[PDB]
Amino acid sequence: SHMASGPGFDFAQAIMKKNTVIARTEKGEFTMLGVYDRVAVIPTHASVGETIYINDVETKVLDACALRDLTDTNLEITIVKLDRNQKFRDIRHFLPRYEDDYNDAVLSVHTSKFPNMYIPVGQVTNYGFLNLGGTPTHRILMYNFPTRAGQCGGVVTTTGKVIGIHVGGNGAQGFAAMLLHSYFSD
């Protein structure tokens, strides 16, 4: 069915090894992408509090911002600033500047149960609006793969671009929230 490229697999591998951690909230375990310095991202439905477990180390959250567009609509991204010695590789230059469609993407998961899994998801479409668990959400990417709980937070990449994080699905399709350069560079 779906296929990815060699450089695509190697690009995903480099992001996972250097820019992901296992995050655990009250709501469960999630893959977490670190973007730069001590700034990382996680789906809003994870309900981040004043503390979070990062690789099983409880870490103080210095700040969190649940992202909403100018229509005050959910984007399902929550940016968190972490009180933790280690800093992230700056990967902002891999973030897209515009909404777009993509071919042969890869979904990568980093949890305790699946500490290094890679899933080619195929063509990613700009789906736009989504009724996500009853919450209207915008800037959604869609792919036809039977995604599962525990893949939320998973990083979706193309060769050279980190395009989103997984946030939902219906049993036959997966949905990711867009990542955009403007969210982190202003």
Ligand X SMILES: *[C@@H](CC(=O)OCC)[C@H](C[C@@H]1CCNC1=O)NC(=O)[C@@H](CC(=O)[C@@H](NC(=O)c1cc(C)on1)C(C)C)Cc1ccc(F)cc1
Q: Which residues bind a copy of itself (CB under 8 A)?
A: 1-7, 9-10, 13, 16-17, 112-120, 145-146, 148
Closer CB to a copy of itself, residue 70 or residue 172? 172
- Which residue number, 35 or 132, has a Cβ lying nearer to ligand X? 132
Least distance between a copy of itself and beta carbon 8 (Å): 8
Residues with a catalytic annotation lie at 45, 76, 152
CB of 186 to ligand X, least distance (A): 25
Report residue 131 as tokens. 């009724």
Q: Which residue has the tokens 């609509």?
A: 73
Q: From the list ligand X, a copy of itself, none, which binds 3 (C-beta under 5 to 8 Å, kind-based)? A: a copy of itself
Rounded (10°) CA dihedral 21, 26, 28, 34: -20
Q: Which residues does 47 contact at the CB level (< 8 Å), separation at least 6?
A: 25, 26, 27
Q: Which secondary-structure segment (H or E) carries 152?
A: none
State which residue, 16 or 165, has the beta carbon closest to ligand X: 165
Return the structure tokens found at 73. 């609509």
Q: Which does 118 bind (CB under 5 to 8 A by kind): a copy of itself, ligand X, none?
A: a copy of itself
Place of tokens 């500490």: 115
Task: Tell whether the torsion through CA atoms of 133, 136, 139 and 142 is positive or negative.
Answer: positive
Binding residues for ligand X, per CB under 6 A? 27-28, 45, 76, 130-133, 135, 147-149, 151-152, 167-170, 174
Query: Rounded distance, CA 32 to CA 165, Å?
Result: 9
What residue 130 binds from a copy of itself, ligand X, none (CB within 5 to 8 A, per partner kind)?
A: ligand X
